[PDB]
Amino acid sequence: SGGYFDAHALAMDYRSLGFRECLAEVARYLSIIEGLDASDPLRVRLVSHLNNYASQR
Amino acid sequence: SGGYFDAHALAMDYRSLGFRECLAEVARYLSIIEGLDASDPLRVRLVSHLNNYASQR
16 A cells, blocks of 8 residues: 555465466376377366366465 | 565565466376376376476476
């Protein structure tokens, strides 16, 4: 408030970004390395689990 | 360092922490939900890939 900015709260926002960086790598890895397409059961279950985990937090 | 709060350093730590939280959830999810033990090929490759990706950063 006022002339003060909560840079600590801003720092905490990096947690969700780091979490999603890993989520993105999970999707890329499964797709490109493991060769699991967009309809693969495991790929969809795992990535959606991570999405829901992040949203809950 | 110095007499001030370094929000930059804290942000970097939250970023690295968030990435590892996703990695932790991936390992836990595979074990508990998917039922893949610690020596399962897929789980081993994915968890090891992410762990290496993290350290690489």
